[PDB]
Structure formats: C-alpha cells, structure tokens
Amino acid sequence: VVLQRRDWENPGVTQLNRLAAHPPFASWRNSEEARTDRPSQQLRSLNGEWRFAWFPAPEAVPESWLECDLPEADTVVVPSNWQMHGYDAPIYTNVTYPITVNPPFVPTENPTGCYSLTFNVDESWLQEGQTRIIFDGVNSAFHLWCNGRWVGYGQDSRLPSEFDLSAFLRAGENRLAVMVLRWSDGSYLEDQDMWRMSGIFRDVSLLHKPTTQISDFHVATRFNDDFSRAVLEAEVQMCGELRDYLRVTVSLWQGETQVASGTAPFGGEIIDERGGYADRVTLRLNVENPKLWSAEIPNLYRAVVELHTADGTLIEAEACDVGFREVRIENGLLLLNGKPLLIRGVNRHEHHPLHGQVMDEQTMVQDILLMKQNNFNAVRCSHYPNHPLWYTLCDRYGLYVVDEANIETHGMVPMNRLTDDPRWLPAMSERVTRMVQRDRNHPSVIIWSLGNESGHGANHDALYRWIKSVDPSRPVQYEGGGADTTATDIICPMYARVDEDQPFPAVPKWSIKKWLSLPGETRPLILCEYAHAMGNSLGGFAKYWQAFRQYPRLQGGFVWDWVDQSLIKYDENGNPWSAYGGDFGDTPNDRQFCMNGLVFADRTPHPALTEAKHQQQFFQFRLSGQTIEVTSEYLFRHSDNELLHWMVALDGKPLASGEVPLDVAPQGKQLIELPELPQPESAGQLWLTVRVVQPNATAWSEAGHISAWQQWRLAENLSVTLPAASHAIPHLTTSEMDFCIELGNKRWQFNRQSGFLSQMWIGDKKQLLTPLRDQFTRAPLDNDIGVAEATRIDPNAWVERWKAAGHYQAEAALLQCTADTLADAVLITTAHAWQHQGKTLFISRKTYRIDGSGQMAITVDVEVASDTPHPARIGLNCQLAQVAERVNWLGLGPQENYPDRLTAACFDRWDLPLSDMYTPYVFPSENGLRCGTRELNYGPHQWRGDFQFNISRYSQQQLMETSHRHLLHAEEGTWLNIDGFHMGIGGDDSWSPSVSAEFQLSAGRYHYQLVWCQK
Amino acid sequence: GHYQAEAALLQCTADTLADAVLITTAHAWQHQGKTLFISRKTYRIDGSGQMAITVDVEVASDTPHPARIGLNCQLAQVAERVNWLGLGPQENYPDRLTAACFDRWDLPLSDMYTPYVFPSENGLRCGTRELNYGPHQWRGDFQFNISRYSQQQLMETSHRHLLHAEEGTWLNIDGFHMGIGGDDSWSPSVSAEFQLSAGRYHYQLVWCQK
Ligand SMILES: O=C1O[C@H](CO)[C@H](O)[C@H](O)[C@H]1O
Ligand SMILES: [Mg+2]
Ligand SMILES: [Mg+2]
Ligand SMILES: [Mg+2]
Ligand SMILES: [Mg+2]
Ligand code: NA
Ligand code: NA
Ligand code: NA
Ligand code: NA
C-alpha cells in the first residue's frame, strides 16, 4: 500500500492516523511536580543512538528492514539532519525550488532516510492508559512502523506528529522503523531561503496518558480598563468515558502562593439547539492586581490543570506558564497592556554550524542572551514553528514572538499559484491550525503569522479568518501580495525604505512614512524584515530608528537576520572553515546569500551588532548646557538597575568623570546637571560621553553591562600657536629618474616616471613595499554586488557600474611632477589622470611639503567626472614594510564603522591589536574601516588630518579575488588605505542599489590633507 | 562676536617657485579671547598672470554656524555688464536655486541687486564656475554677489530708498553660503543640510585679467 499510494505526492494526504494537536503535555500524576515543572516519569525521551541507512529512493528500501535491523546500517545520534553526517549534500537555494516545479510530484530519485530504534517499554505502560510516540520534527515526510506493523504517516517538517502505539507495543523490547522522505508534496510549501536538509531533526518522545485524560486546554486572560483586575479563563477538554464524579481543578500560582483556584464538573454551557459540550468545562478565576507580563518584566504565574474524581483522586495533571498580558490594536496602534509597543526585533532561523537545523537548549539561551544584551525585545520565527523549548525560554526571559506557519511557496510563478488554489487549502490549513493548537498558551507569542513569500491567495484570507475566530487574543499578520492585504492586521512590509518609494507593479514597497497615510489606511506598520545585514551592512540603520521614534504608527521591525547560515567543513589538515552555498557540490545554489546575520554562525558578533544595540537603546539623551536630559522608552519598568556614567575628555585625554543614579519612570524624564566643567588651557575639542551601566547582574546580563551611550561635542579651542622654528632644512637631490629629499636620517623618494612617493627611509631601513598611490575603488561588499540569486546580474549594481566604467582597470597617467626648494621646506607637485578607453574618470592633483621638522604635508585635490558612477572611495593606499602589534588612533571606534553606519562608534583614543582591525566576513570584502579619524599611529608612523582608514595584512586586490575568508593569506608588511572620503555601505536590501544619496561621493571635486611624520 | 571679530595675523610668508611666486597666509578671528574662525591661504601667481587662491577655513564647533565662508573686496571699477557661467539669471541661494539654470548669463550691473524694501544680503548667484566684470575674471566653483552696496551699508540701512551707491563695486565671492530659510520668519528656519556645520571648509579661486 505504502509504495503503491505514494502519499508523498498528494497534497490531499498530509497525514494518516495522526493524533489531534494540543499544547505541551507531560501527564504528571503528581500535582506538585506539575506545578514546579519538574520531570514527568510519563514523558520519556527516545533521543540518542539510532540505526540509520540511506537509500536513493523509497523503492530501494528492502522489506526486511520493517522487522529486522539492516546490517549495513550505521549507528547515529538522533535528533539529526543526515546531511550533517555526510550521507548526502545539504543544498542552499534561495527562491528556485531544489526540485523540478511539477506539483504535486517529486523526483524519482528521492533521498530516503531509514531510521530504526530498538527500545524498552515497561509492562506498567501497557496494562492501562495510552502510549503515544511524538516526533517533534521530521523533514519532510515519513511513514512509521512499530514491530513490523504500519502505524501512520505525517507531513509538515516543523510541527510535532503524534501516534497511538498502544495496540502495537509489547512489554520489553520493541522496534520502531521510520522511513523519512527528503522530498514530498509538503516540499512545495517549504521553499524558505535556507539550507535544504532532511531527517529526524527534533526530539522523539514517548508519552503515557490515562484512558480518561486531558486532551486539550486553552488559557485566556482578560482585564479591566487599568489592568488592576483580571479574569483567567481556562477551557479544558477530556477524552474517555464521561462520569458524574469527574472534576477539573484549575489552580493559579504566583511562585509558591496559590492565588486562585476553581473546581467544576464537566458540562459546558449550551451553545446551540443540540446542547453543549458534555466533555468540556471552563473555569474562571478572578485575579486582583495581577503582575503583568512583558519583555521588560516577564512576570509569570503557573496554571495547574488537575483531572480528578470529586472525592480527591488525581487522574492526571497538565500545566503551563501563564503571562498576564493583553495584546490589541486600537486606533491604529499595537498595544501591549494598553501601551504602544516599539519592536526592536530580529528574524531568527534555527541554525547551528555543526548540527544544521537541530536546536539545543544551550544555543537557544546563548542567542536570547546576546539578543537582550543588544537591546532586542522581539523575534520572528522565520519561517516556521520553532522547537517547543524556544517559546518556554521566550516566556521566561521575556521576548515578544511572532509565531509563523511553515508555508513558503516563493519559487512558484506567480507566487500565489498554490495559495490561491482550493486544492491546496487543506495542506495549508494544517500548517496554520496545528501551530495555533500547539502554541496558543504561550504569553511570549503576541502575533500569529500565516507564513512567508507565498503571494496573496484566497487560502490566506480563509485562514486569517480562522485564527481571528479561534483566537481573538492575538493580531494576525502576513506580508505576501503587497504587505497590506486583507489577510493582515499589521502593514508588515519587507525592505520598504524610510523615505524612498519602490513603486513595483502590483506589490509596491512605499516609503514606510508614506505607507501609513495612504487614503483609507489606518493600520500600524512593523517591518517583518528590514536592514538586510549581509556582510558589511546595516548602513542607514539609524534612519529607520529616527522614523520609528517620530511616527506613532511606525512601531518597529525585525532585522534580517540573527545568524549567518554558514556550515563547518574541514580541509586536508582537518582544520575547520565556514562554508556557504555550492561548497557541498550542491547545484544550482545561491552561494553566500545564506549568510545575512548580525552574528557569525558561532555567535561571534559582526560589527553591525553594535550599531543595532545603539539604535535600539531604551534611554534617549539631550544636552542643554550642563543639563543632561534622560528619557526612558520603557513602557512598564522603572530604571531600577541603571547608573549613568559621564566623562569629559580633551582629544582623548580624560578631564573629568562621575556617576549619577538613574531613577526614571517608564516614559518619564530625569535632569542631570553636570558640575562646573573645567576649562582646558590646551587646544582641542572637548567631548562628553555618557553611558548607562547596569550595576546588578540579571537573568540575561552580567554586572556592569552597558545598555546605552551617547556623545556630544562640548567647547572647542582651535589651535593658533605656531610650531617651533626648525633649524634644519630638507635637501633636494634631483636626478633624471627620482626626486630624493633628505633631512637627517630620514629620506623620501619620488619617482619621476610614475609621479608617486616610491620609498621612504628611516636610517637605512626601507619603509614601503608598494608606492603611495591614489585608490578610488574598494573590494566589493555584498551590498555592492547586489545579488540575491546567483543566476541573476543587475546592471544597476554598484560593482557592475564600477566594472563597466573601468574603475577597477583604470591606469594612472602622469601629467606633472615638479620639485621646488622653499625657505624651510621642499615642495613636490604632482598631477595624475585615470583613464579608460579614452575617458578621463579621475584627476588627482597633489602637493607634498616636507619641512625641517620631518613632517610631510600631503594635500590632495581630486576631480571626478560627473557622468562616471560615483566612486567607492577617494583616498591613498600603500603597502608598508612594518608589521606592528598595535594600532592606536584618535577617531571613531573601537569597532569597524562606515559613514552610514557610525552612530554607535565613539570619538576617543583607541588602541587595539592589528588583528582586531580586520573583520573576518566569510565572504571577504572591504572591511575594518574607522571613520572621523584625526590621528593614526602604527609602528614608527603617524598620520594626522580628518580621514577614514583601514589597516590589515590583506590588500583590496586579495579581498576582491578571494571567495572564502579561510583562503586569505597574510601579505608582506601591512596594507594601509587612508581615505579622505568613503561611500556608504547601504543595506536597506542586498539585491539592488541601497546606498542613500547623501552617502554617495557625488560632489565632483574633493579635497583632503594628511600629515605623515615619524614618532 | 561674528560681526565684530578681528583678524589676527598668524603667518605671512613669500616664496619663489620655478614659474611662480607663492604667498602663504594664516589668520585668526577672535572675540573676547575666543577663536571663531581660522583662515589658511596660499596665493600662487604664475607666468600667465593668473593668481590661484586656495582657502582652508576652520570654524570652531561651538560657535554658531556662520552665514558665509568667502572673500570680499571693493573694486575700483564700475562696469556696465556682469557676465557669468553659473546658476541664473535671477538671484539664487543654496536652499532656493532649483528654478535657476546653469548657462552663460549676461546682465546689467543693477540687475545683480535685488531691491528688497528692507535691505539685506541679496543678489547671490550660486554654482558659478566663471565670473566676468570689466578686466577681471574669477574662476572656480563659488557663489557671488556684486553691487554698489557694501554688506555694512545694507545692515545699517532700514529702507531701500536710503541706500547710496558707494565708490566702485563691492564683490562678495563665497566658497559656501548658508541657506536663507523661510518656513517661517520668526524662528530659525534654515534646514540642517544648509547650515555651514562641517567645521572645515576648502575652496579655491583663480583671479586673472581678461
Ligand atoms: O525576503 C526575504 O529576504 C531574505 C533575504 O536573505 C530572506 O530570503 C527571507 O527569508 C525572505 O523573506
Ligand atoms: Mg502528501
Ligand atoms: Mg490540591
Ligand atoms: Mg523566500
Ligand atoms: Mg551619537
Ligand atoms: Na513609533
Ligand atoms: Na538569504
Ligand atoms: Na537606578
Ligand atoms: Na571577496
């Protein structure tokens, strides 16, 4: 029947013999164990060592496997993705399906994973009650046998499938056989932009329930106008024989105190002409002054549901954590406990670099900690229901959750081909309804989502209404078909820009500000995805946050995304490296487009994370004279774990500092008058830096955690004092090929054919390995490349425009090189033109003035043809002979910063190891720039001015020629790129030009000045 | 103290090059001991009689952003026409120049003055690459006004009919000029992107004889 029916090529069959969905059960037989959420002896884990064999098709699986272990089978850990054990390749594709688009059919060659487990069942489990097996995640479809007998079938890779094994088991040893299909009709609804894997990748458990049992329960909390009174309403359903003596007791607990309790027999109210539910009961408990749940203060109660005889016999108990909170949209605003939310959100895939799509508690906790430490309060489950533990942790640690159905049909043409088709309504409905049935009691879930990138079909509208009907407590959102359809309560676009319209036909992405006020529009707007964090990205992040704060109805967004989907591979020597699309022989593939994270796969932060943290701060600051005004953006909590530190420094030199306790109400203000500020005699800019410090450790943070900062310029005293009269004067030696300048042991060489400074000497020591030359290009960022599908090339992409214009191939042509002897200096004047196919792209005119103090003043004036694509940078570069341990600078830092991503950086004196000045993006590009630098120190060298710089062992050429970071080699000496000017990095998306006009180098004429000297 | 700031000489040197003379200057404008602006210049006069002026200005970050960054002088000459390659033909300012077109414009001198009943700074033309007046030509990328009335007289005179033509011609040539605003006229109304807030400014001009 199995091979004959081909249930995996039939959307009308998504399960066989699968039990109804429900909230998490453990069947405690002791109420105290239920209350305290301790282990239940009635819920067993079958995680561990299983037998596994791989086959190329289900037709290749031998019948013998149903009753006997296959000798060729291996013993593997479960849960697991079998690609991670090397049985076949994981496939990274974005939009295009990994299989031929021919619904409902899948390939004949359909990788088949045969799992089996021989396991013990106690006699006591079989003498009474019901023994079920629960598969929390099987990707993508499976048949199940127990002791050679066929049990059932299941689809949907991301929700639990449960089966009654009572009639199949024997006391002692039993054998399960699970046949997992890689591809099924379910795969058409699972086209998420992620690695395509398969297997038994979530927990497997065995649950014992009594014959008379709790089969479902729903918890709701409703409130009066000021939230000083609540009613908890618990609906409980039973299965078994109905009897007069049966009762349900629901008890509610605030830690160790029972705050409320209610007991009732079964028999619901009359609902229609045929009566009511005799197998259900609703308990209503009054709660005065409930402690409310939010991400800020995740107050939780425990609800215990006891099924019992009236005279006191507990049959079984179930339980959940209860968060007292109201979610509603009123007058166009999303409210949590009557207050408008500001969503500091991120999308988070379930991804581990070693284990693939298998999740563990440690990784989940690590992620939540890092998120909260970086000022996130919300997470979107892109794009499927998560491992059940995720919700428990979000409940307890406090994060707002968008729970999203496992439906994505991106690769369909058009996108709604399946979702507008009623033949596909049953399969879609199960992915939505079974999510709701499972997760509806979690307070952390505040919004339901219908899926992702499946267009807008009638099936979406039907399922939107289904949720609205069954669960009025939570808004429903869905972005497909233009982000503002009749299937969404929230305008939830992806990559809509702040100010710029993107008027695509049918599905425009309006400026978010404009979107709110379109005729007839009243809904709130929260971006489901924004600020695409691919590689060197998050340019213009502050622009979103300014808009969010100014516009009541712009209530935030979810950054895309949390973590790079890179996977670990090993080289010849067994050394690990980060791999992306195509690295497993997977083809077609979308290469690096799977890496979009604010953190690397091992959870090491990208530089972008600090920009996110800074913009997502909960305290706002204004400066008026000596007055600092602190404003809290908290809705509920006081600043009861917050101290304000302040420091005033003159060009990095500390002049004063102190601390002031913060006592700020939610949404309130506090004025801090700074003491009489000292007047520095010395020249320079005074800078004020403030930081909010948390003196006490929390569940999510260490003592001393910095949660917020800001800087201001204070007084500036411009230097008017003259540099000391240098007694010596530099000697010019003129030859046919060189202009050589000497002053003591210092020597400079300017090549007369090239027109560049080709060498410097300190004593007899060479200082340069490559000459100091202008550079107008950068090793392209992923945003410059502007690709989302590897087959596609956008002629509009910055890298394409630069390449076509000849920026990367333009050669320096010398126009002028002269030397003049001054009264206290030697002056070298140069002019160069950069040309491609007879077209002059750039002209550089320079003076080098070396005086008797040993300093070399470099003045550069550059012309850029108005019709050439604006250049990536305007600066100089050289390869120094020096390799030094440290980099010291007075500029913005300490982390990597670019013109459109530098708000988080602070102006101070920074000192770091050379390695910290390189950002190891897995796909190499221009990296590690620091902006607003007035002084740079490296080895014996010092540069002064007002410039941007990066410094590393890797040239721009190597970076642009290398696809993987692990293939980079340290070059001789150190490559230095010093920029007068540098283009924004953008990132509003990574598949179209996204650098805003104000960050493009469009001025045509540029001036900058550097002083190079020794110290 | 912007209107009463006094120029203090920091540096004034002269050098001879292979085909030119180079004059280097530095000035500080101060008020009550506070240095508001520093102007560093080079004047390069070559064998073709062209005087290349390079100007680099520091503006104290805590002083209000200045109305303009430029040079002014009273020319001995009165000439009939003003001819320029830049935005025109009418008066235009950084935040009010979209109507203006880049072209070669030639007007009588009197049209380079706008007779606002209450006198103020007026007649500026932006985005100018070449200006011609009598024997003089200025080249660069600048804003300018040219008229018989000094900035001093304009600020001291309440009514246009009370203005008297001064000897010769007042020329104001700006590397940079602040927006004029106008969202209202009773509060600061110049948008941030039109305020002269960069701290360090660079402009260059060539003065020659035509
Ligand atoms: O539109 C999207 O942008 C992301 C780009 O990485 C990713 O593909 C998301 O799954 C998708 O919803
Ligand atoms: Mg099927
Ligand atoms: Mg009791
Ligand atoms: Mg997609
Ligand atoms: Mg700041
Ligand atoms: Na808002
Ligand atoms: Na992606
Ligand atoms: Na406090
Ligand atoms: Na690269």
Ligand code: NA
């Ligand atoms: Na006046």
